[PDB]
Predict the 3D structure of the following.
Amino acid sequence: LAEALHSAL
């Protein structure tokens, strides 16, 4: 989930 958010951002 952390990395999903990194990509999203």
The helical segments are 2-8. The chain has one helix and no strands.
